A paper describes a structure:
Thus, the [name] conformations bound to the separated halves of [name] have relaxed toward the twisted G-[name] conformation by 8.7° and 2.2° relative to VA3 complex subunits A3 and A2, respectively. (G and H) Comparison of [name] A3 (slate blue) with the G-[name] structure from the V1V3/[name] complex (orange, RMSD of 1.4 Å for 351 residues).
Author numbering:
A (entry chain A): 2 to 353
B (entry chain B): 5 to 39, 50 to 368
Write the structure that this text describes.
Amino acid sequence: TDPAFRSVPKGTPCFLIWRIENFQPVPVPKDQYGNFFEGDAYIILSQKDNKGILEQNLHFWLGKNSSQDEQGTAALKTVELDDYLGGTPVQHRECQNNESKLFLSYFKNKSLKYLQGGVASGFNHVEHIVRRRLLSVKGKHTPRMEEKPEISWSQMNKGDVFILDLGEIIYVWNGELCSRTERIKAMEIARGMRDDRGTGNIIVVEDGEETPDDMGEEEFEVFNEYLPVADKEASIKSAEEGGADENFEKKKVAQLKLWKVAEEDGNLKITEEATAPLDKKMLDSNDCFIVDNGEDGIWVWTGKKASPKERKESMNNAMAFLKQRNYSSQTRVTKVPEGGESSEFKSLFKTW
Amino acid sequence: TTALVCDNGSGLVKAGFAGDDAPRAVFPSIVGRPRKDSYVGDEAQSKRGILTLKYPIEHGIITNWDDMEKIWHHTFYNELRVAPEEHPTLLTEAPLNPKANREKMTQIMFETFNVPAMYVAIQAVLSLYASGRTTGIVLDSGDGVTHNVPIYEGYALPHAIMRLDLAGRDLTDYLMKILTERGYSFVTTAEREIVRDIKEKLCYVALDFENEMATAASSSSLEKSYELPDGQVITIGNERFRCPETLFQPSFIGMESAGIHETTYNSIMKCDIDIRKDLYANNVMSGGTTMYPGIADRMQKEITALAPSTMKIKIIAPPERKYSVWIGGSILASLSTFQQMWITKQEYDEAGPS
Ligand SMILES: Nc1ncnc2c1ncn2[C@@H]1O[C@H](COP(=O)(O)OP(=O)(O)OP(=O)(O)O)[C@@H](O)[C@H]1O
Ligand SMILES: [Ca+2]
Ligand SMILES: [Ca+2]
Ligand SMILES: [Ca+2]
Ligand SMILES: [Ca+2]
Ligand SMILES: [Ca+2]
């Protein structure tokens, strides 16, 4: 039972008013009865003892600017308060400037006043913002992916392969001096992204062949809208200006580090389990593990049989790494449930 | 802890987190097995040739429990990417869902995904709450089923619930047929998705069918263009409103059932007389098949002709009504009494699915 409804007298007359605030009916101070905010929803319970019987009227008042969550909470809570009092109350839906005479009778002396504004909506707005990013695939033995801090030609070079990730449409741009292993590993990274999201068309782009003829009229528009071809030559870096493919891979292998978050005898310990080649069998379902890829992503692998303290402290310390090392905003911590590992997460493991 | 809200629909799965105003995962309720043992949702549709694709849910009632497990597995681990053992989960069920069906949803949810708690809510009831109402009649029309659920003070009246097996997938089939009679080529399942897109973008409900029919027969002012994936452009004429007209004239598709305006009227007439005035004034529409332009004014017109003249007819068509069920469940799972009405894993392991 909602703790704001427990003090409702179940047999004696009363007159109570609640105000919906963040999915919760907050009781209104008694002297403020009648002061209604247009942006909020209220619940009004009237119980009168008319000639030996208790007539129970249950009104929920909806301001003209009330949010959808407040209107649904008022409707849901009215039913909850109805069933708690036996079901005998009668429900009335009251809208601003269209209230019933019974509702207005409660406030004839108390003065009904419509006030502007109200408490903020408890809803979290889902914006459905697509994550657009310029990816970099570079290496000799096994090319590694890196998310660039921007989407431009000044972030690219003619010696590597770049993935223009736009969600539903993926561009794989091959530099004219890119390796043969970079050309195939970029497809695996791209095809893994399309299989993780369940849909999407991949477009293969060669260096210098970005012409609306041998590329595509509509295909060129999207590419040029994010990567203008005119600004290419001044901004694109030479293959020589891009570093050594071997040095880049050596940097990325070194930053990989697997942490272990286990409970032991009730005292949680965070040891350094391994580095170097990482294997799938290192991840045990009875514990949690933090896969440290540094500025390119912190991944929290959560086993099915893990303890609650293991799950909470694994995210906490992974979040702690970000603030301590003062990583940029684009470095993210991602909880990875066992069995829901993405292709990008599996890429950090050499054997799987 | 934040809860999960999964609205298992006949054609689409709407899943997300309690507290959000919209679902974050909207993928088709499809399981594809080859002719990687399974494919779910969009990837199953992106690989139609290699696999055979089956609907785990039929007319709102879930029928293939093994393939539905893959739906929920794909929902938790692939779409939302959450550990289901960490989140309470609110599910939705079709009106008049059998009890043994609701028990097996609970069994799978507890001894396969190990959720800490769960609850099952009726889809039409959640839509009424989403509109800020406790009393009214809901017209819920989706891909596979259409229902008329009169609700009074937060609880449906099961004796007056109507079930119409005419919905969006039937309308998509009808548009494939009449466009093929026109001279186009749409018969395959891959072309079903093309026509479904044609239906959602260019179809509408005519306020006066015979007059709109006479307009399209004398000029080309109602004809629109649709670009196929090939690049070929085709012309859609009176098919734009002949397809949604099946909702009001089921005989178009070969069905002698009553129209959605009559079933709405027949449902209200099965309720007590002293609540019909509120039922007429609170026609809440829900589902994607109710997203046709003009369906609200046509329902307003058709019901006003069947009902007594002293009754005020009001149709409520919320803008986001294709997600009304999920939004209604998001509010319920955000209420601090969702904990009181749910069944926990320990209670289920002790007492059982009953
Ligand atoms: N703008 C639109 N116009 C017409 N129809 C639409 C539109 N948008 C979606 N639809 C249809 O709505 C249907 C899916 O909606 P919804 O998710 O409410 O149904 P469902 O829950 O999967 O099915 P059911 O209600 O039988 O469980 C699809 O068949 C789709 O064709
Ligand atoms: Ca408010
Ligand atoms: Ca009551
Ligand atoms: Ca290179
Ligand atoms: Ca452990
Ligand atoms: Ca549905």
